[PDB]
Amino acid sequence: PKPYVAINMAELKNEPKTFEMFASVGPKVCMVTARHPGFVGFQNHIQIGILPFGNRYGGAKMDMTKESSTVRVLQYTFWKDWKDHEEMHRQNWSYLFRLCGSCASQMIWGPWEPIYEIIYANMPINTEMTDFTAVVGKKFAEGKPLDIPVISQPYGKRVVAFAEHSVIPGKEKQFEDAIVRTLEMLKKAPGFLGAMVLKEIGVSGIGSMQFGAKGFHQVLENPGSLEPDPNNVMYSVPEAKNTPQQYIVHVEWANTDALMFGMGRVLLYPELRQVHDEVLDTLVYGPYIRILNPMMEGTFWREYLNE
Amino acid sequence: PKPYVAINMAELKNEPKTFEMFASVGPKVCMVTARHPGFVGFQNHIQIGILPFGNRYGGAKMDMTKESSTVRVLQYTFWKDWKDHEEMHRQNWSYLFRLCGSCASQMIWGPWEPIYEIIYANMPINTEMTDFTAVVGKKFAEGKPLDIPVISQPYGKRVVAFAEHSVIPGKEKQFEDAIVRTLEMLKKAPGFLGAMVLKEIGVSGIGSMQFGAKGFHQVLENPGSLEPDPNNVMYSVPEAKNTPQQYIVHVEWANTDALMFGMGRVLLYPELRQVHDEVLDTLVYGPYIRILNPMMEGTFWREYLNE
Amino acid sequence: PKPYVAINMAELKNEPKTFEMFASVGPKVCMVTARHPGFVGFQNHIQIGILPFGNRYGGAKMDMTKESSTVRVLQYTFWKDWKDHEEMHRQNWSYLFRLCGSCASQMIWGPWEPIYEIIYANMPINTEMTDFTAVVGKKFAEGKPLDIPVISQPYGKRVVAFAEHSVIPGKEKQFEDAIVRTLEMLKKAPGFLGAMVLKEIGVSGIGSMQFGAKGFHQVLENPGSLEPDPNNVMYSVPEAKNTPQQYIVHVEWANTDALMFGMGRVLLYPELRQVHDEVLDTLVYGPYIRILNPMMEGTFWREYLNE
Amino acid sequence: PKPYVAINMAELKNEPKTFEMFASVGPKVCMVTARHPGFVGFQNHIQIGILPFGNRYGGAKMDMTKESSTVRVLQYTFWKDWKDHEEMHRQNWSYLFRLCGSCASQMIWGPWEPIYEIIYANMPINTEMTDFTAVVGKKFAEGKPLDIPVISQPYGKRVVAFAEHSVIPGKEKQFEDAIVRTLEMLKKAPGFLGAMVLKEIGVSGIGSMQFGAKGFHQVLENPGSLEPDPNNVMYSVPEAKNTPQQYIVHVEWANTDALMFGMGRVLLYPELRQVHDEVLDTLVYGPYIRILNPMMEGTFWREYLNE
Ligand SMILES: [Fe+3]
Ligand SMILES: [Fe+3]
Ligand SMILES: [Fe+3]
Ligand SMILES: [Fe+3]
């Protein structure tokens, strides 16, 4: 079934010490989240650049890692029910806060953790290049050759287009119908590895370290080993849901060229351009497209999705 | 009277070429906006850093300009009626679009231009250190020594704390009452040069280059001298107003130390901490505090403000 | 069905500034061409070298990019009807001319844009190495394993042999019959990714910036933002068709070794050599073979071709 | 059938001279062992690093080869009957001892050669990327597409997780049941190339150069060409079997990322975590996971395994 998605967002200094603590702390956080039975997996991204759209963002490029002073992370966690995420955070607060707190020395902005429902998904299981022979064999044995997916390689060996959209109030239905039509046509592009549409349903205060006054002072005053009152979150997840409605259109690609010209198909192929024009007519903000590298992931979230 | 405020936000490459075109294009844009009789001035900022809040944002410091790969600009324009801003853009579209278009090669994100109402303002006219003798003389001659302001130096010789807040729906009145009480007490801090509270009323589609499909293609395809159809904006300013409600708390200071410890008074002075805790209890997001340098400005906006 | 092909040819300085504007202007031109419903895609090439034929062109080699002072571009655009190309140019002249005009500082020769009919095509859809599992699955599901193509990777991950021929008047039928026989046999060579034969039907005056006196002076005198009169083109496309008849034999290959020895099959394999000798007997000029890298492309032109 | 496994372990100086004599002497030893008809193959490993488990072993990383002063070897030889191994050593002692003796100048610890029975095996034949077409063709021809394996590339082109476990006396049955359930689920991870569980049955005294007093002095006093009395080994293989019972869990992976996150599946996937927790409850020591590179191997041992 379709899981819910929490996306933890933050911006940190682009330096070795940051990536070192990614390697130490990251696995720990993931292991703690896996204590909850509603946890079905994760996909953690580093932003490597921004899609320039010709020279609309002429200062950007798809890979800005060698020049950027900061690094943005987007950590997806997947949940059977979005309430599982909230429960997991509270049940494991002593660990999560202290783990996430150790990132402080590198932090510039965040954490900020919106919650999403998946309203459309065409996402395959991941496989390594070593796997495809056994997959093909099994699918033919089952008489289901149509269920043979593309090869979507895990652990940093593909790229993601993270397209931000906010929609004019009242035009949500038009956006959702048109974007699904768009993605159904987009899958013809070479190197297309899957797409899903995420619709924000709210924000996790606790995941964003957004407390009332009491928790705010505890966060600021913390020596590192004393958690804020997790009960001092002043709003529920849906209470923080944004209007204009926010969506993420998440599209995966074999490589950044396939991404650039593949996403470009909505501009370059007249038949698809006409369909995607219906998406553009609904927007308050966007499309703004971040280029992401899915480096650390628990690939079994796609097994839950596709069962 | 209180003007409305448009704030044009963008992120550009932090390099000499960016600042060179600031010097060339900036004045032109300002001269064009001054064509509209509703224009009462401007205050253009560069972000120089982020308030770290101890080590809450331990990767940040108040002046990150020497290390940052990007520069964020926040360009305030002041208007008798916010509709003046929208009309100005449309009436002078051929000039403005082609001027702002020349920034493309340096752009990474933006432009994004929310519109605000001022719900509280305690902001003096600017004066240079050369002016204060005449100001003192004039005010005593008129029998109005209470009207002698602090010395708030224009053109990059003071700093701004730009504090972002979003508020839980239903708590706006609690937020506004408490933040005004806070700022009324905050003005006692040494080096305090004024404060105002900005409340978002919407977003300018045209100022944000956010069009329907037609305008979107015209923007991407533009050689530099062909404006998109300005009539292709699909939403009004109020249709894009965010819920949760967004506020900017804008506080000006003599220098970055006075800023750090002055803003810090809301944490460090128990009486004020109690008042400001009422603000904290209302928030979905924030406070997130950007450190700004007001470099280019038309100081007469404060003359309109203070009559 | 078979589309018509326009090939825009130009020679520019081989330096970073040229490739930077390829990246800036290129996408824009492509987005503009896609405004016309008869546009079915594109394939843009950079020449990387010349096939030396042993030492017939002993000063040449297949990759001369590190030593050449110039770079030649060959930009294919594909059209349902060749008149669509002409119509597109005229309808979008203000954008196209200003876009192409910005290349001026790097230009040494061109643009020159002959138009071609395709008289033979054996060209597969492009696929990334990630795609083939799904393609195989789909074709077996449909009971059409013979329709499983070779893997022809898009976006610079294969190479093209661009073979220029001009034919003795009266020998066109012999050339065409023999070259098709040749290519039908050539497809047995390892790493063969497809072939097509293009027959010139004329030249686009507007795409070649070839006007009468009025337009000529407008081009020379242009500050960059004032298009020449597009009605000052003095000849129709067929009026410029060359006699001797010109052809392009366009053959795609996995890599430059497969290209060299694969094309060489028409000299090295006695049975194929006898067939290809019938081609050679018809020539006024050629074969002259440019080595091309297809870097930027709209791969959906092959979907139109093979539907 | 399942062969028995002898694993020769040693630690040597990490320098070119060590690898040079690996290349000279290594093949010789393998040729001598192949004199015995019970020999069914071998898989020789170099340890390239240690799995850090987040920062549990924070001084370790998966590839420590550029920094380490030593290199550990683990040389698997496979035998129809474990007694064949003992027989081979004694029958060919003059060659083996003089061959292994030439390693002396580089040795820091070892040799130590435990013997194991395989209690679980899910291990495919090796294939190069060049082979899979013919493999697929053959299996479909035989009507057995389910017997198409993953591509497990020989000769250094994959990696091994070498997981050491020792089990509480009385808990061997629980360990063995749980670890098999674990590995049966683990095979779902991307890039999983096979697994087996080795259970120690004893230690080869002769393979470990562990003699009585007489042989000890002969070893120490040897000029290089005088073997110790091979009959002076004072214990049989089973007499040296350890309690607590020792196991090796041997898992092969496409690459070190697939290894890290794949092995990590027993921590990150809740369903598998519950199963694997039953393994953890039985342990005296471990899991300690060495990262191995299978460089030199006789791949036909897997043909014997899978018949
Ligand atoms: Fe979370
Ligand atoms: Fe504006
Ligand atoms: Fe053209
Ligand atoms: Fe041995």
Nearest beta carbon to residue A58 from set B59, B107, B235: B107
Helix (H, G, I), strand (E, B) or coil at A101: helix
Concatenated DSSP letters of A44-82: EEEEEEE--TTTTTTT--S--TTT-SEEEEEEEEEESSH
Distance from the alpha carbon of residue B285 to the mean position of ligand 3, in angstroms: 52
DSSP A243: B
Contact: B54, A282; criterion CB under 8 Å? no
Tokens describing residue B228: 């998109």
Question: Are the beta carbons of C31 and B220 separated by less than 8 Å?
Answer: yes
Closest CA to A259 of A280, A299, A281, A290: A290
* CA B235 / ligand 2 centre spacing (Å): 15
Query: Can you tell me whether residue D238 is helix, strand or coil?
Result: helix
Can you name the residues that pair with C121 across neighbouring β-strands? C196
Nearest-angstrom CA–CA distance, A239 and B169: 7
Question: Which residue has tokens 């506004």?
Answer: B176
- Which residues, other chains included, contact C233 with Cβ-Cβ below 8 Å and sequence gap of 6+? C205, C206, C210, C211, C212, C215
Give residues whose Cβ lies within 5 Å of ion ligand 4.
D 6, 207
How many residue pairs bridge chain A and chain B with CB atoms within 8 Å of each other? 138
Q: How does DSSP classify residue D81? A: S
C-beta of residue C189 within 8 angstroms of C-beta of residue C266: no
Q: Tell if the CB–CB gap between A296 and D140 is shorter than 8 Å.
A: no
* Partners of B248 in the β-ladder: B164, B198
- Contact of A54 with A267, CB cutoff 8 Å: no
Cα angle at A175 between A169 and A178, to 5 degrees?
160
Q: Tell me how far the alpha carbon of residue C89 lies from the centroid of ligand 3, in angstroms.
A: 7
Is B220 in CB contact (< 8 Å) with chain C?
yes
Residues 147 to 166 of B: which have CB under 8 A from any A CB? Answer: none
Give the distance from CA D114 to its chain's centroid: 10
H or E, element range at B285: strand B283-298
Q: Which residues contact A16 (CB under 8 A, 6 or more apart)?
A: none
Amino acid identity of residue C270, one-letter, is P
B226 touches chain C (CB under 8 A): yes
Resolution in A: 1.8
Residue A250, classed as helix, strand or coil, is strand
State which amino acid sits at residue C8: N
Instruction: Report the C-alpha gap between B151 and B171 in whole angstroms.
Output: 36
Would you call B226 and C32 a contact, using CB atoms and an 8 Å cutoff?
Answer: no
**Closest ligand to C93 CA?**
3
Give residue B85 CA to ligand 2 midpoint distance, Å: 6
Q: Do B239 and A168 touch (CB under 8 A)?
A: yes
Method: X-ray
Burial class (CB in 10 A: 0-12, 13-18, 19+), B50: buried
- Determine whether the interchain pair C136/A140 forms a contact, defined as Cβ–Cβ distance below 8 Å: no
Three-class SS state of A298: strand
Contacts of C255-259 with C-beta under 8 Å, sequence gap 24+, read: C255/C158, C255/C159, C255/C191, C256/C62, C256/C63, C256/C159, C256/C291, C257/C191, C258/C189, C258/C190, C258/C191, C258/C192, C259/C51, C259/C62, C259/C159, C259/C161, C259/C191, C259/C291
Q: Which residues in chain D are closer than 8 Å to A24, comparing Cβ atoms?
A: 54-55, 58
Selected for mutation to probe chain C from A62, A132, A261, A272 (highest C CB count within 10 Å) is: A261
Which ligand has its closest atom nearest to the C-alpha of B82?
Answer: 2
Distance in angstroms (rounded) separating the CA atoms of residues C225 and C70:
27
D85 is in an annotated binding site: yes
Please name the residue of chain A whose CA is at the shortest distance from the CA of residue D188.
A300
Q: Is A60 on the interface with C (CB under 8 A)?
A: no
Asked if the C-beta of C91 comes within 8 angstroms of chain B's C-beta atoms, the answer is: no
Chain C: residue whose CA lies nearest to A127: C130
Whether residues D145 and A127 touch (CB distance < 8 A) is answered with no
Whether A128 has its CB under 8 Å from any CB of chain D: the answer is: yes
> If you count them, how many residues does chain D have?
307
- The rounded Cα D133 to chain-centroid distance in angstroms is 30
Report the separation in Å between the CA atom of C101 and the middle of ligand 3, taken as the mean of its atom positions.
Answer: 13
